[PDB]
Amino acid sequence: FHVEGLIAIIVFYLLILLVGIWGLLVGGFTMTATWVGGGYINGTAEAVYVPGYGLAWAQAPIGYSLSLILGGLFFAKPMRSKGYVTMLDPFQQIYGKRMGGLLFIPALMGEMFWAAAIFSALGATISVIIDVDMHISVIISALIATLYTLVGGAYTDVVQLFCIFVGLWISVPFALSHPAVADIGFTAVHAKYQKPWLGTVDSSEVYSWLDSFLLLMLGGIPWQAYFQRVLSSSSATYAQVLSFLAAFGCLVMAIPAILIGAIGASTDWNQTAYGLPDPKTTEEADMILPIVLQYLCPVYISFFGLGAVSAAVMSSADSSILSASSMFARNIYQLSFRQNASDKEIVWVMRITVFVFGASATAMALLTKTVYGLWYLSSDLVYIVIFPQLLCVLFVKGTNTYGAVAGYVSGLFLRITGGEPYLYLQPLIFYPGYYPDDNGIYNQKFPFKTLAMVTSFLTNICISYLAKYLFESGTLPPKLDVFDAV
Numbered sequence: 185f186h187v188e189g190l191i192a193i194i195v196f197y198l199l200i201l202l203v204g205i206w207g208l209l210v211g212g213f214t215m216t217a218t219w220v221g222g223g224y225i226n227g228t229a230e231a232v233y234v235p236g237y238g239l240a241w242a243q244a245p246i247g248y249s250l251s252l253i254l255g256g257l258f259f260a261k262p263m264r265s266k267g268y269v270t271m272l273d274p275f276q277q278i279y280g281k282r283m284g285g286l287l288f289i290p291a292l293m294g295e296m297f298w299a300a301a302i303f304s305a306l307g308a309t310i311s312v313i314i315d316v317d318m319h320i321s322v323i324i325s326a327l328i329a330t331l332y333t334l335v336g337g338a339y340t341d342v343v344q345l346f347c348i349f350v351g352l353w354i355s356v357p358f359a360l361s362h363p364a365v366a367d368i369g370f371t372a373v374h375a376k377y378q379k380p381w382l383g384t385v386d387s388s389e390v391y392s393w394l395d396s397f398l399l400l401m402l403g404g405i406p407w408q409a410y411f412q413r414v415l416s417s418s419s420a421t422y423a424q425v426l427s428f429l430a431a432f433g434c435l436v437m438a439i440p441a442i443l444i445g446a447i448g449a450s451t452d453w454n455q456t457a458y459g460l461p462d463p464k465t466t467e468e469a470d471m472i473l474p475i476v477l478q479y480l481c482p483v484y485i486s487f488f489g490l491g492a493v494s495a496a497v498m499s500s501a502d503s504s505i506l507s508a509s510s511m512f513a514r515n516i517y518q519l520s521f522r523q524n525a526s527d528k529e530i531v532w533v534m535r536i537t538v539f540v541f542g543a544s545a546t547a548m549a550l551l552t553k554t555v556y557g558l559w560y561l562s563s564d565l566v567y568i569v570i571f572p573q574l575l576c577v578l579f580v581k582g583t584n585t586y587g588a589v590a591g592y593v594s595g596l597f598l599r600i601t602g603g604e605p606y607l608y609l610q611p612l613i614f615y616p617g618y619y620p621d622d623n624g625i626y627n628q629k630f631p632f633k634t635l636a637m638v639t640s641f642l643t644n645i646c647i648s649y650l651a652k653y654l655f656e657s658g659t660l661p662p663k664l665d666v667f668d669a670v
């Protein structure tokens with residue numbers, strides 16, 4: 185029942201690894217393999233299931249699959265025109281050496297959120313497999329992943345995705361025919377057991393929905409992996425064709441997950457073995473994919489499907505943790521901090537970084553209780569700190585290092601003053617339209633995120649141009665300036 189569950193996890197992890205010891209569509213399918221991880225498939229299964237959200241509020245699968253599109257036509261071509269090897273390069277030359285390090289901290293935080301999401305998904309899967317508590321399972325998974333990252337001493341992304349694709353598409357047909365599950369064509373409009381899974385956006389929340397969509401479709405462009413892969417390709421048309429293939433792949437991958445949420449929503453949980461309380465009354469509603477894959481499906485198929493899905497995700501953490509640790513070692517720390525790989529220095533620092541990243545990721549995975557919340561917050565700080573300047577480096581002329589600090593502080597001021605519902609923080613500026621959610625944390629209905637980004641943008645050029653006239657004639661001697669961008 186339970187102890188055989190470990191064999192299911194172990195037997196697949198080897199195959200995904202031994203085969204890792206061993207025409208252009210492979211590029212598209214390995215670009216699709218960065219975004220479709222352990223959050224997509226589990227968060228967009230949450231968004232449909234939770235009452236009061238529905239499909240209309242599951243804006244992330246559409247958001248990222250459109251960010252991959254808007255990247256190719258507009259950002260891919262003009263980056264290659266000046267030969268930037270990576271996203272770090274444009275910040276270094278025109279904003280100086282050190283500002284590049286300080287402009288990558290929000291990216292590190294975003295990667296920390298993303299890493300926490302995978303730990304959260306893995307914990308739930310292991311918990312349903314062997315009936316252990318969440319509080320222990322996520323810790324165990326974090327320990328295993330962090331240890332294997334450094335004690336471990338080739339197409340690994342292709343294999344992991346071709347296991348998820350088969351695993352989900354083999355169980356969903358069988359669950360949909362279960363006696364408990366009813367017609368899915370009627371519970372999308374007339375609420376047989378719970379509110380219809382096809383969501384709604386009222387006249388009040390239009391601005392909030394548009395603001396979230398802009399945040400979540402314009403905050404995926406400046407990520408590191410996409411711009412690393414696009415820049416490497418030899419042909420410019422090759423890059424955009426790969427981008428469109430990746431968008432298509434994500435859209436096709438987003439179909440099995442939606443059906444799982446609908447199956448979970450349209451079910452009579454009093455007839456199956458989950459008891460009278462629904463997964464919503466008991467605050468266990470992120471487990472919707474594992475729950476429907478285990479209880480509704482028969483014995484043999486669940487043993488294949490759940491094991492394959494878990495083992496596919498297990499190989500995602502090793503890439504992300506190591507990439508973020510190397511990121512911290514080289515871009516945030518080493519720049520202008522002269523050290524070499526000696527006894528007490530950078531490689532020891534990178535060894536230590538892995539432990540801190542794992543501990544922070546699991547600590548935040550334990551505190552927050554929603555995967556979709558983490559996979560939403562992973563695209564906020566980047567959206568409001570990096571993209572506003574990434575626009576000005578590429579197209580705007582005359583941006584100086586002076587302008588960067590003003591926008592940096594101005595956007596963060598409005599963002600942290602606004603407050604967050606997911607992470608418990610109470611607003612301080614109290615934008616009009618605020619209403620209480622749960623008698624506790626207040627929630628605002630004003631596009632303060634987009635307002636903050638736009639304000640950062642319009643101060644970046646303004647103060648930067650002010651400095652240029654400030655350092656020429658009539659107002660200020662040139663000598664007394666901390667930096668010299670003139």
Ligand SMILES: *[C@@H]1O[C@H](CO)[C@@H](O[C@@H]2O[C@H](CO)[C@@H](O[C@@H]3O[C@H](CO)[C@@H](O)[C@H](O)[C@@H]3O)[C@H](O)[C@H]2NC(C)=O)[C@H](O)[C@H]1NC(C)=O
Nearest residue numbers: 363364365377451452453454455456457458459460461462
């Ligand atoms: C799903 O829920 C239904 C109803 O909530 C459960 O069915 C009911 O189970 C009770 C338990 O013995 C049956 O006994 C009845 O109890 C009431 C209590 O007042 C009594 O007044 C009746 O004379 C009778 O003894 C009841 O007949 C039964 N009702 C139906 C329509 O089946 C059911 O057990 C739950 N679980 C499932 C279906 O897996």
